C-alpha cells in the first residue's frame, strides 16, 4: 500500500512528482498534489483537542 | 406544524372548461386515480439519462401540468366548503383518498365550472381534524398555486440569512454528496409529502440552503474556487449530459456571508423550462420548502400576468412585498461561463466554445417544443404543454438583475 | 455541568460544541440507514448493417 | 433469373405482419390492395440500430428506441430491418409480438429477397396462423433465418 | 419521522450519550464515503462509452433517498495511485512484466 | 347454516328438461391463441425465464427485494455488478465475484 516510501529512498516526503528528461535539455515534470483528504482534517482536530 | 394554507386554481386560456380528459385521469403514474404525491412516480425507477416522455405526455413538465389542470376541477371543498362532482367523478371519501365514479346513493351536487378560484383550507373543517392523513394535500395544492400564478414558468423563492450555515444543517447536508439535482428534488418532494412537519426543522433549513446553493452555482457565482460552506454544484459539458449537475463538497475557499438578509422570488421567463429537467427540479425543490413553511411574504404583482393581479393571500403591491425576478437560461449560461473564466477555471477560447454548444443545445429544445405545440393544439381539449409565442424564446427578462442578486447573495 | 451542555443548558443549539477546548459527553447526532444496491443489466449488440 | 425468380422459390420485396381476421378469400402472395404505412409515411417509425427497449415504472408501459435514438411508444406502425431482428428477436418476441396479436400495432420487416415456403390448409375448418409464425421467430438467430412461411 | 421507506425512516436525528470527539470522527467518515458516491444511473453511459458504442445496455434501478454506491474516484487519486505504483516497483523494475 | 328447503319436483323436472350444453365441438371455431405466451415467465427486471408463476414470484421475492430489511447491520456488501444478460442469445453472465 505504502511500503516503497519506507523501504527505499528518504521517507521525508513533501509532494510527489514524476518527470522525464528529453535530450534537448527540456524537462517535463508532472506534480500530483493529493485531493482533499478527510481523515487528515479530523486527525488534526484530535491532536488539537 | 402549519395548520392553514391558501391557493389558486389554473386559468383557462380562453377555453371554456379545464383542459384534461378522463384518460389522463386514468393514466396517472401513482396509485390508481389519485393525484396526491405522484409528481415523481413516473421516474421512481430509472435507467440511463434520457428524459421520459410519451405521445400524449410529450414534455417533462407535461405530466405535472395535466395534474395541475386536473386538480382545478375538484378542489371545490377549499372554496365552497363542499365536495362536488364533475362529469360523474368525485372523491371516494371526505379524506379525498382518490377519485372514483359517483355512486348512485347520495350523489354530490354538480360542480359549477369556474377558473382562478381562490382557495382557503379553513373552508373545509374536516381537513384540520384529519391533518395527519391529509397532509400531502398541503404540498400539492401549494405546488399547483405556484405554477398557476405564472403564464411563463413556475415561481419559486430564494433566501439567504446573515448568519453562516448552522452546524446542524451541515451534518444533514453531507448525506447528499455526489447526488444529481433531479434526485435531490425527488427526495425533497417526498420529505414534505408524507407526514406533517414543523416549519422549524433541521431538514427544512437544510433544503432551504440547498435551493440557495444551487442557484448560486447556476449563475456560476458558486464554483469549486468559491464554495458556500465547502459545498457547490459541479457541471458537465453541455454538449453531453447537460443536466447531470451534482453536489460536491470541497476544502477550498468559502464565500463570505452577505451584508444583509437576501430573499427574492424567481421565475423562468422562456418556454425552455417545459422540456428542461433542471428547471423543474429547482422549482419543485424550492416550492417544497415554501409548502411546509408557507409563503414568507406576498409577491409583487408588477411583472405577473393579468389574472394574477391582486390575489388575496398571494400577490400584492404594498410595503412588505418581495419582488420577483425572471431570467432566460441562455444568457444565464453565458454569465455562468463568464464567471468561470474570470475565476480562471477556463480559458476564453473554451468560454466561446461553451456558449456555442449551449446555444445549439437550447435551439433543439425550442425546435422540439414548437413542433410539439402544433401537434397538441389547446383547442383539442387537453393542455399537455403550455402555449407560447415564438418571440418568447428570445426574451432576456431580468437576467442581468438575477446574476446581480447572486453576486450580492454570495460574497 | 460543563461537560453536559446539551443536557442541562436552556441555551443549547443543536449540534454545537466547543471541541478544541473540552469534551462534552451528551450530544445530538444523525443515525443513518443507507442502502447498497446491486445491478443486473441487459446489453444489446449493434446490427450488422 | 431476376424476372423469374419465383420459379426458384425466391421472392422479392418486404414482409408485413398485421392481424387480419378474414372470412372469405385470402391470397398473401398476390395482395390486391396497396400495402399500408410504406416506409417514410406518417407516424411510421423505424427501429434503432440496436433494437433495444427500455422499461418504465408504475404503470407506464415500455418504449422502443428508434433510429433517432429516442424511446417511442410501441403501439402504432413500425419497421424492422432484418439485421436488427436477427439480433433482437428475443425482445421482439417478448414485447412487440403480443401487441401485434392484439392488433394494436403493425410491423413491416425489411428484407430485399428471401426464400419462401407455403403451407396449404382447408378453408372450411378453423385455423390460427400465430403458432407457425411463433415457431418461425424461434429459429431466427444472428447467423441466419428460416424461409418465410 | 422523515423519508419513511414504507415502515422505517431513512435517517433520524436524536440526542443520546455521545462524546463530541468520537462523533466528529464518525461524521467525517460518512463524509468520506459520500465523497466516493457515484450516481448509478450514469453506469449505462459509462459502459456504452467504454465499449466505444459497440454495446448498448440498460440497467434499471430504484431511486431511494438513502443510497450509497462508493465507486467514484477523482483523476487526482488515480494519478497519485499511478505514481505510487512506480515507487513500489522502484527496487525491481522487472516486476512490471506481468502487466 | 341457513335452511335449504328443496324445491318442488315438477319445477325441478321442468328446469332440468331445458338444459342445453355449454360448449360444443364445432369445427368452425374462429379459434384464437392467447395474446401472451403462457408457457414461459420472465422476470420483468432481470429477464430470467421461468417455467411457472410460482417460481417467478419467488425469484423477484428474493433477487429483486428493495427492502430496508434489517435494522441490524448487514452481514455483507455486494459489488456493483451482479449479472448481465446478452439479449442476442439469452445467455446470462455472472460476475466472477459480487461479494
Swiss-Prot record, chain B:
Where it sits in the cell: the answer is: Virion
Task: Name the source's superkingdom.
Answer: Viruses
Q: Which UniProt keywords apply?
A: Capsid protein, Intermediate capsid protein, Virion
Any Gene Ontology CC annotation: viral intermediate capsid
Q: Which family does it belong to?
A: Belongs to the reoviridae clamp protein family.
Function, as annotated, reads: Located at the interface of the incomplete T=13 outer capsid and the pseudo T=2 inner capsid, 120 VP6 subunits clamp and stabilizes the inner capsid shell.
Its quaternary organisation is:
Interacts with capsid proteins VP3, VP5 and VP7.
Name of protein? Clamp protein VP6
Native source organism of the sequence: Aquareovirus C (isolate Golden shiner/USA/GSRV/1977) (AQRV-C)
Gene encoding the protein: S8
From Swiss-Prot, chain C:
Describe which stretch of the whole protein the shown chain covers, with first residue, last residue and complete length.
1166 to 1214 of 1214
Q: What is stated as this protein's family in its record?
A: Belongs to the turreted BTV-fold inner capsid family.
Enumerate the subcellular locations listed in this protein's record, separating them with semicolons: Virion
What interactions and quaternary structure are annotated? Homodecamer; each decamer is made up of two conformers of VP2, called VP2A and VP2B. 12 homodecamers assemble to form an icosahedral capsid. Interacts with VP6.
**Top-level division of the source organism's lineage:** Viruses
Relate the protein's function as given in its record. Answer: Inner capsid protein that self-assembles to form an icosahedral capsid with a T=2 symmetry, which consists of 120 copies of VP2, with channels at each of its five-fold vertices. This capsid constitutes the innermost concentric layer of the viral mature particle.
Biological source species: Aquareovirus C (isolate Golden shiner/USA/GSRV/1977) (AQRV-C)
Q: What is this protein called?
A: Inner capsid protein VP3
